[PDB]
Design a binder for these strands. Structure first.
Lengths: 249, 716, 735, 91
RNA sequence: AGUAGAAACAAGGCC
RNA sequence: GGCCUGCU
């Protein structure tokens, strides 16, 4: 109901009607990236400079109807002045902390299921067992190794169709996945995330990260396993070796 | 033939078919019979779908015209007439909502009663072959298929015909209308067989017009056209042309190697001129501290109250008077500014609660001291052209200045220990691995070594001052603000303590660019008389403000106590980089830990404890008139920390240029000392490159003097 | 006793303590005003290194151009751009012979990419010079403006959605009598053929800031949008070629560079017997970009693309053809001050052609006098050579050809050489039975380099015995030695947001521990200092302290409200549990089991009004410009929390005549959000097609209402309402 | 850098000895039953006031002038810059 | 004045 | 005096 209604409201005004009519689907990306905002050259300097202002961050308009304009002593939490090239409003950082102490609460039980990679890292480290540190010269030789320890033996494009069919089943188009490994992955990640309401985009991004294999060139000495490379900073050094066995093994 | 589609069919269908024509990118002028055939297919699709509605029952309600109501459901909903992306969108949506099977090709319609697809195709040939043809094109299909053909016959599997027969009479009447209208036209010489499935195209990227002429002007000197040059390139083969030109080329084009020996390198020449002055934003070696011995932590507390309490701890105030003038400004303004600061500090002391941040009055005194309303007003060139004085901004090499001995002593005392701990580090996760325990022990050793160091005190001073200045500039852009220089340490006894070096008055700070300058005036207490090294205080105005009595065995000194007052400035980039001075600790201690690890790779054991306690091994860390002096690892830590701190304090382009062009020569000298037969192509050029970076910066000149001393001691 | 750190090198070798010689703890040098002086100096220097060439006047642009190719051979060691066509063609032929099938294959993959590439690939770029407004703007904005102008002028082939078609339209625009542009102050202005040619062939010049390692500032250039597609295709070909060359090091990272350097040094020295001596030259090329003539790149590519479809050759040749006629905008201008009348003025650079020279100093006066003859419509012709490393990969190809030309099969002498080339820098290992052989080999290498327009910087180069050398701030001494002073500037708060900054800092510490041999205790100190700076920057202190800030009240109440305070994030004033073992774990997941369910739910709430995600590309990618290197992107692990807000934008557009761009931004974003709600996959996979917005949106409304009734919330009343509303918007679009 | 020590030998207690090393510099010693001991560079406690270190940069030589010798000075005395081979001193 | 260094800041524009 | 902006 609503969606077509703001569609009609947009088409009511002449300029947006022209934009909707003359613009083709292919140009979607271009106009979506059409912005006057330059990409910052020195982010640290301005982040240290903007945070000294009042209302340094930006938030959706809806914040004006969930968080009061001021806190107990009267420190303002949000302003009604919109951003430069968006309908979002500039708000103070307190509106963040406020949201974490009296804002609406939900059931975050499914975030562990979504962010599978990070929670698997935590579980692997929690059950790890350290050993003695041995001091001897390490011959670090540079090798190509896979960093992602949960890659399902799929490439970027190879798993992209799987991700769409898992999250966006209707926009798949011609592709119907042939490999049965992809079939089982789709089934599992479909039944697992059937009602998760985090965001389609973040779900797709994390599925891409988990399933897609990624490789990088690093100086290693021993190890060479996927689980042993994520902790390469902790097990191998310039003149010391720290024996380690992740919780998985 | 196109006249037929001009005449008969309605607009809607003809533009739908024209967009379907554009879909796959073939042109309509070459073969139009496909257009007519598929537009008739689309027409039968409509005429078969429309006029067919359903209500909550099955048994579709058929109405010649949809009456105004909510009961406008369509019996058959069309697939084709849409783009491939949307056709597959509808296919997938129907499959996911109906729980049916996904076909591999494009259907034409969907129906509810039987909950499935219809692929309508009316071909010229008779049905009973085309049907099974498209059937074997589609794999294991449950979608029912139904086709007509011009003779008027119908067929389908399951003997199934999904709706009214009068509609099918409609279809075949339409069909024979088409047929015996082409009869008047006469198209069957090709109508039965006009499409054979042609798909081919050649990509054409032709250079022509102006862009061709440009190609004719981007060739070697003796070529006339891109065609000729490409023909020459294709016909070109290697026939020893590099050798001919190498032989013909003059022999003066050479890269002769000049041997680099011990007697080759000469000392770097330093610029000559007036002595070098002080550039720091605060006093480093001549600072004085007024303290309260409070239990508050670094960030804990309120600045103004702490400053006032510290200043009340000192007795012996005198009416201030000029001792050493600025030599270029108006010292009475500095005097009046100091008295104004004192008066307003008392004014705060009187009232109820000390404000967290105070704003000062904009008197003419600080208007001059902070450089207010001095930027020339911006105008247009068309209005100022006849002014003779109008010229460019002064753009020339900076003034030349010779090195002085004060920077050496300042660095010397910047590496000395102190009676306080100037670093209170944060918390870290409790160490769980033995390597983490080793790291923590190493870190504790280095913290014990460097915390009691003037370099750490300078780091904290700079970080706090720049943080406060940046925050005030970003908050109080318009109005002058008072900020007391505060630094909190911990005594040997363990009691926490605060220290007040002085005050900073920040001025207008409407900083847009990263290079825009915010001006402030800094006042700092000290005991060092400025009458002994005046050239180091060229830009300072120094007053006499009191007398101090520090307990000494020579009765009690009752020394004078002066106020160094100056106008300084910074910028957003400078403030940001000065508030990250704590990475000097990193740089230094990373270097020391690299030393320790490299040495411990030799002996298979951690070597930190004996390095820091036994102090047997020592590194050359300075030269005395007797000779080169070596110090323990802790002294090396402090020296490197001081070097990094001074790099962060006296940073400038001269420093970067000299560092690079002297690292080159240092590598060459190291190669010489390693017996690697080093050689150079133009050493004079490298020397000139190094010597052009030394202009007026005390730090870079001191580094150059150190480099000359290192060369003199090396090469032996 | 006087302390002197440099004397430390008398006991510790120079490379083992080279980190001390990198003053990367202070503010790097920045430029303050115009870059016009540097642009003029660079143009004059590029034109006078090729003075002995031949002059011509382009019949299209009417600008003077200097062709030095096949010019007189140099007779001195000064820089020279007199490259010889036959010599370079022979070098490329030998490169092909030593690597058969390189050019044909690379051309095949490049042809595939060019004929399947899309227009949107041009949006994935940083600032570009939009000619519609004569100023630098984001790549997407400039592309959109150029497409709009083309469509308004009648060039609508780009509607095919293919980059090749966009380039076809671009070339067709060159043959138009009169184009039209829009300006706001809206006014429609007409550009004739020559003016549009110069506007499409021009470059925008700026001054490079944050450049550490030199006393003087330099100038850099940014091209337009008409020429970026050809550049993209040419660089794709060059990258595909260099990936097949082991002597190149430009298309790889740092660790790969080190590995290849070690391999080449071991190969050269190990194969050398006791009789052969080995020497390493640590060479830098003076005026690398100013001496590389685009015509020679045209020759190299036309030799590479031999026996290939003519359209491929044409599309790959268009780029150097435009660079050979490239123009450069002088810059921002010059600012004058009058102290007698106490005023300042800013004259644009376009007046340099006619403005009198009384206001300029001697140096600038002479520079303007020398560059004036080349001024055409406020921009200077820069035909002789490249401006700033636009063809990095082709330059690397030429250098690799030079390196391979001494494989001992072409030297025809006892001496031989090899090494590694990365544009403007190289390491050359030369072996020969005697010092005379080494001298002859280096002399011939230098001479051959001078025949290709490449000069070796004698002042910044030195030769020693193999085993010790330098390459791009990587110091090799019997094995590469860590520096850690190049990455020091990256140890602070990045400046993206709270969660992003935390994750980026911990990940940077981890990486520098893995690669740059950062010590354990040093890493712990870095973690402590980073946490301190992070808390002091975001006003998020431990909460149990009495540090009054603008955010210390809410943080303190959250602290007192929470029961398990160990689960609070550092952003919310909680303890830091990070350590050397936890540097690879996001903060949210490390504290997940310690958080209270109320705080956990409030933190990670999808409905939070702070989190905003635009595209799959910008989810967890942060662009950090590394010190002493080109802009780079990093993947940082982070959980989408309420702290993932995006900061405020500039907001200064409101005072400029270009104020309508914000309204267009808002309307485009509203339409894009509506489309995304209609097409959820719009962000992850960019939609493709040739239909218009409203068609897809209305038709999908039809179908989705239908099916969501066939099972879902919709009702007949609502479904029919949607159907007739779709009809209403249909008839509205009709009129 | 190569180094050669001279001037060691057998001496009486309370005697004197001038070590010289042909090539910052100094002198360390090694008793038969131990590792290295610092002598001079600054002098150690066990040898201060008795022993004097000096150098002639024009001769490229560092000297150690030992006086009022004790039986506990009996060691191989090594010069350094790089380490010499050491010269035997027996008191 | 001051910052800074091959050109700039020492607020800008709009009424 | 009143109001706008701080990488456009």
């Amino acid at each position: 109901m609503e969606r077509i209604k703001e569609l009609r409201d947009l088409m009511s005004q002449s300029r947006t009607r022209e934009i909707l009519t003359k613009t083709t689907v292919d140009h979607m990306a271009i106009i979506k990236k059409y912005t006057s905002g330059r990409q910052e050259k020195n982010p640290a300097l301005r982040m240290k400079w903007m945070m000294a202002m009042k209302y340094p961050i930006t938030a959706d308009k809806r914040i004006m109807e969930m968080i009061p304009e001021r806190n107990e002593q009267g420190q303002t939490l949000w302003s009604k002045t919109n951003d430069a090239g968006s309908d979002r409003v500039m708000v103070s950082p307190l509106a963040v902390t406020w949201w974490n102490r009296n804002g609406p609460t939900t059931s975050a039980v499914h975030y562990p299921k979504i962010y599978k990679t990070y929670f698997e890292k935590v579980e692997r480290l929690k059950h790890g067992t350290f050993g003695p540190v041995h001091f001897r010269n390490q011959v670090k030789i540079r090798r190509r190794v896979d960093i992602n320890p949960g890659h399902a033996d799929l490439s970027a494009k190879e798993a992209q169709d799987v991700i769409m069919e898992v999250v966006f089943p209707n926009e798949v188009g011609a592709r119907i996945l042939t490999s049965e490994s992809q079939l089982t992955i789709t089934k599992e990640k479909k039944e697992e995330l059937q009602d998760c309401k985090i965001s389609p985009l973040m779900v797709a991004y994390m599925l891409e990260r988990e399933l897609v294999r990624k490789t990088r060139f690093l100086p290693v000495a021993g190890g060479t396993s996927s689980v042993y490379i994520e902790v390469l900073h902790l097990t191998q050094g310039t003149c010391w070796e720290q024996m380690y066995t992740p919780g998985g093994e | 033939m196109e006249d037929f589609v001009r005449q008969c069919f309605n607009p809607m269908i003809v533009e739908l078919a024209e967009k379907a024509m554009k879909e796959y990118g073939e042109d309509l002028k070459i073969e139009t019979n496909k257009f007519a055939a598929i537009c008739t297919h689309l027409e039968v699709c409509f005429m078969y779908s429309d006029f067919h509605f359903i209500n909550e029952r099955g048994e579709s309600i058929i109405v010649e015209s949809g009456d105004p109501n909510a009961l406008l459901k369509h019996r058959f909903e069309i697939i084709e007439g849409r783009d491939r992306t949307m056709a597959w969108t509808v296919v997938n949506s129907i499959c996911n909502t109906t729980g049916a099977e996904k076909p591999k090709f494009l259907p034409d319609l969907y129906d509810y009663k039987e909950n499935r697809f219809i692929e309508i195709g009316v071909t010229r040939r008779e049905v009973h072959i085309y049907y099974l043809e498209k059937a074997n094109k589609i794999k294991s299909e449950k979608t029912h298929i139904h086709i007509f053909s011009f003779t008027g016959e119908e067929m389908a599997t399951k003997a199934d015909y999904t709706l009214d027969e009068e509609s099918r009479a409609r279809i075949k009447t339409r069909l024979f209308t088409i047929r015996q209208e082409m009869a008047s036209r006469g198209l069957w010489d090709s109508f039965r067989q006009s499409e054979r499935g042609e798909e081919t195209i050649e990509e054409r990227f032709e250079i022509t017009g102006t862009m061709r002429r440009l190609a004719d002007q981007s060739l070697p000197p003796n070529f006339s056209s891109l065609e000729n040059f490409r023909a020459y390139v294709d016909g070109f083969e290697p026939n020893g042309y590099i050798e001919g030109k190498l032989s013909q080329m003059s022999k003066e084009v050479n890269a002769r190697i000049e041997p680099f020996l011990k007697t080759t390198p000469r000392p770097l020449r330093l610029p000559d001129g007036p002595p070098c002055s002080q550039r720091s934003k605060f006093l480093l070696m001549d600072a004085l501290k007024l303290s309260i011995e409070d239990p508050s932590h670094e960030g804990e507390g309120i600045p103004l109250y702490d400053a006032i309490k510290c200043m009340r701890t000192f007795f012996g105030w005198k009416e201030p008077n000029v001792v050493k003038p600025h030599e270029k400004g108006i010292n009475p303004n500095y005097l009046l500014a100091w008295k104004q600061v004192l008066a307003e500090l008392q004014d705060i002391e009187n009232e109820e609660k000390i404000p967290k941040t105070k704003n000062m009055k904009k008197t003419s005194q600080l208007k001059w001291a902070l450089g207010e309303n001095m930027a020339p007003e911006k105008v247009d060139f068309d209005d100022c052209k006849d002014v003779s004085d109008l010229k460019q901004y002064d753009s020339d090499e900076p003034e030349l200045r010779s090195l002085a001995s004060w920077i050496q002593s300042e660095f010397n005392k910047a590496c000395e220990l102190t009676d306080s701990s100037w670093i209170e580090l944060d918390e870290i996760g409790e160490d769980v691995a033995p390597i983490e325990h080793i790291a923590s022990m190493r870190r504790n050793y280095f913290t014990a070594e460097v915390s009691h160091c003037r370099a750490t005190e300078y780091i904290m001073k700079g970080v706090y001052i720049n943080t406060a200045l940046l925050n005030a500039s970003c908050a109080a852009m318009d109005d002058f603000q008072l900020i007391p220089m505060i630094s909190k340490c911990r005594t040997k006894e363990g009691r926490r303590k605060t220290n007040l070096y002085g005050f900073i008055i920040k001025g207008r700070s409407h900083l847009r660019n990263d290079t825009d300058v915010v001006n402030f005036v800094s006042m700092e207490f000290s005991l060092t008389d400025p009458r002994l090294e005046p050239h180091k205080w060229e830009k300072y105005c120094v007053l006499e403000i009191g007398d101090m009595l520090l307990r000494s065995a020579i009765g009690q000194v009752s020394r004078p106590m002066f106020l160094y007052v100056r106008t300084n400035g910074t910028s957003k980039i400078k403030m940001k980089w000065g508030m990250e001075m704590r990475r000097c600790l990193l740089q230094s201690l990373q270097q020391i830990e690299s030393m320790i690890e490299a040495e411990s790779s030799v002996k298979e054991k951690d070597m930190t404890k004996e390095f820091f306690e036994n102090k047997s091994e020592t590194w050359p860390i300075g030269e005395s008139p007797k000779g080169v002096e070596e110090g323990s690892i802790g002294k090396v830590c402090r020296t490197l920390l001081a070097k990094s701190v001074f790099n962060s304090l006296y940073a400038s382009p001269q420093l970067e240029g000299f560092s690079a062009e002297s690292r080159k020569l240092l590598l060459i000298v190291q190669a010489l000392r390693d017996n690697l037969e080093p050689g150079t192509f133009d050493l004079g050029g490298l020397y000139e490159a190094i010597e052009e970076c030394l202009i007026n910066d005390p730090w870079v000149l001191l580094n150059a003097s150190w480099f000359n001393s290192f060369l003199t001691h090396a090469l032996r | 006793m006087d302390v002197n750190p440099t004397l430390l090198f008398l006991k510790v070798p120079a490379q083992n303590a080279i980190s001390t010689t990198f003053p990367y703890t202070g503010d790097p040098p920045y430029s303050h005003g115009t870059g016009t002086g540097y642009t003029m100096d660079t143009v004059n220097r590029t034109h006078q290194y090729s003075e002995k060439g031949r002059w011509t006047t382009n019949t299209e642009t009417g600008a003077p151009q200097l062709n030095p190719i096949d010019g007189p051979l140099p007779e001195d060691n000064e820089p020279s751009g007199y490259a010889q066509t036959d010599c370079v063609l022979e070098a490329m032929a030998f490169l092909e012979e030593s690597h058969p099938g390189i050019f044909e294959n690379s051309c095949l993959e490049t042809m595939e990419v060019v004929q399947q590439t899309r227009v949107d690939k041009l949006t994935q770029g940083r600032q570009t010079y939009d000619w519609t407004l004569n100023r630098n703007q984001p790549a997407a904005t400039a592309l959109a403006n150029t497409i709009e102008v083309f469509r308004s002028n009648g060039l609508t082939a780009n509607e095919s959605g293919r980059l090749i078609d966009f380039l076809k339209d671009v070339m067709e625009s060159m043959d138009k009598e009169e184009m039209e542009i829009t300006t706001h102050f809206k006014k429609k202005q007409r550009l004739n053929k020559r003016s549009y040619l110069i506007r499409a062939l021009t470059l925008n010049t700026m001054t490079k800031d944050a450049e550490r390692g030199k006393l003087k500032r330099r100038a850099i250039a940014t091209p337009g949008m008409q020429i970026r597609g050809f550049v993209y295709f040419v660089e794709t070909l060059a990258r595909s070629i260099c990936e097949k060359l082991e002597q190149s090091g430009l298309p790889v990272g740092g660790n790969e560079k080190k590995a290849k350097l070690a391999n080449v040094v071991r190969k050269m020295m190990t194969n050398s017997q006791d009789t052969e001596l080995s020497f390493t030259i640590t060479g830098d090329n003076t005026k690398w970009n100013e001496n590389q003539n685009p015509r020679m790149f045209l020759a190299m590519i036309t030799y590479i693309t031999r026996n290939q479809p003519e359209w491929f050759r044409n599309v790959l040749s268009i780029a150097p053809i435009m660079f050979s006629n490239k123009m450069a905008r002088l810059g921002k201008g010059y600012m004058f001050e009058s102290k007698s009348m106490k005023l300042r003025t800013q004259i644009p650079a376009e007046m340099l052609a006619s403005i009198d020279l009384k206001y300029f100093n001697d140096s600038t006066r002479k520079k303007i006098e020398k560059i004036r003859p080349l001024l055409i419509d406020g921009t200077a012709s820069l035909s002789p050579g490249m401006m700033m490393g636009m063809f990095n990969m082709l330059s690397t190809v030429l250098g690799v050809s030079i390196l391979n030309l001494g494989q001992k099969r072409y030297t025809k002498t006892t001496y031989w050489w090899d090494g590694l080339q990365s544009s403007d820098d190289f390491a050359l290992i030369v072996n020969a039975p005697n010092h005379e052989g080494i001298q002859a080999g280096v002399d011939r290498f230098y001479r051959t380099c001078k025949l290709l327009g490449i000069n070796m910087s004698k002042k910044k180069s030195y030769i020693n015995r193999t085993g010790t050398f330098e390459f791009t701030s990587f110091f090799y001494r019997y094995g590469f030695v860590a520096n850690f002073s190049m990455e020091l500037p990256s140890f602070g708060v990045s400046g993206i947001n709270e969660s992003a900054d935390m994750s980026i800092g911990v990940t940077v510490i981890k990486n520098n521990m893995i690669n740059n041999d950062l010590g354990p205790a040093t890493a712990q100190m870095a973690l402590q200092l980073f946490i301190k700076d992070y808390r002091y920057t975001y006003r998020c202190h431990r909460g149990d302290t009495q540090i009054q800030t603008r955010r210390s009240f809410e943080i303190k109440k959250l602290w007192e409200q929470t029961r398990s305070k160990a689960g609070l994030l550092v952003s919310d004033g909680g303890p830091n549990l990070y350590n050397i073992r936890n540097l690879h774990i996001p903060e949210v997941c490390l504290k997940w089991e310690l958080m209270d369910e109320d705080y956990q739910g409030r933190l990670c709430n999808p409905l939070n009004p702070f989190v905003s995600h635009k595209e799959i590309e910008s989810v967890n990618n942060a662009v950090m410009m590394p010190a002493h290197g080109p802009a780079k992107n990093m993947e940082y692990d982070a959980v989408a929390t309420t702290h993932s807000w995006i900061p405020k934008r500039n907001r200064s557009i409101l005072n400029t005549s270009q104020r309508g761009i914000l309204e267009d931004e808002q309307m485009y974003q509203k339409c894009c959000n509506l489309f995304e709600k209609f097409f959820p996959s719009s962000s992850y996979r960019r939609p493709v097609g040739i239909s218009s917005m409203v068609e897809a949106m209305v038709s999908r409304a039809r179908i989705d209402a239908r099916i969501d009734f066939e099972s879902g919330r919709i009702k007949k009343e609502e479904f029919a309402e949607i159907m007739k509303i779709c009809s209403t918007i249909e008839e509205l679009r009709r009129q | 850098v190569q180094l050669q020590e001279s001037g060691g030998g057998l001496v009486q207690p309370g005697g004197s000895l001038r070590l010289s090393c042909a090539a910052a510099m100094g002198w360390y010693r090694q008793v038969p039953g131990k590792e290295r001991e610092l002598v001079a560079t600054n002098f150690a406690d066990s040898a201060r006031g008795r022993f004097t270190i000096s150098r002639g940069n024009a001769k490229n030589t560092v000297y150690l002038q030992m006086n009022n010798l004790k039986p506990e000075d009996t060691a191989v005395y090594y010069c350094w810059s790089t380490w010499g081979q050491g010269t035997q001193v027996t008191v």
